[PDB]
Amino acid sequence: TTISPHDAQELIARGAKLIDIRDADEYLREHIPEADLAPLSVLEQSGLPAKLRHEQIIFHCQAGKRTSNNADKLAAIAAPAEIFLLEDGIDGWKKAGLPVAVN
Numbered sequence: 319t320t321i322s323p324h325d326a327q328e329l330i331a332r333g334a335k336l337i338d339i340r341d342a343d344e345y346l347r348e349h350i351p352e353a354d355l356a357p358l359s360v361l362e363q364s365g366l367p368a369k370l371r372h373e374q375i376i377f378h379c380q381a382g383k384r385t386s387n388n389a390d391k392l393a394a395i396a397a398p399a400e401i402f403l404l405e406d407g408i409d410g411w412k413k414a415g416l417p418v419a420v421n
Contacts, residue, residue, distance in 0.1 A: 319401075320402065321402040321405060322414070323413075323414035326402070326411075329374050329402070335370055335372045336376045337356050337366075338353040338356070338379070339356065339357060339379050339388075341357050342355065346421055347421050348408065350408060351418075353378065358379075358391075361391075373399060374400045375401050376403070377396070377404065378408060378411070380408060380409060381408075381410070382404075382410065384407075386403065
């Protein structure tokens with residue numbers, strides 16, 4: 319399931335984890351302040367660490383592509399949580415007028 323930036327905000331206000339699956343260089347250039355960084359490649363190797371587990375987990379990437387194309391991997395990595403993909407990624411978050419942190 320995809321989730322709008324505004325609906326994601328409401329879930330984050332109730333403790334949902336927002337996980338940025340991009341690389342550190344991308345994150346450092348521009349990220350969502352509420353997000354926790356966990357690059358997809360690291361998640362594929364060693365799994366989701368316990369500190370990033372929650373009843374609700376929202377993954378995001380740049381523009382929706384990496385989340386859409388790895389939906390089955392992400393579904394397993396965060397199981398058995400309720401899992402969402404941020405619609406249009408951080409680009410979507412920006413377009414909705416929600417805050418980002420730029421280097």
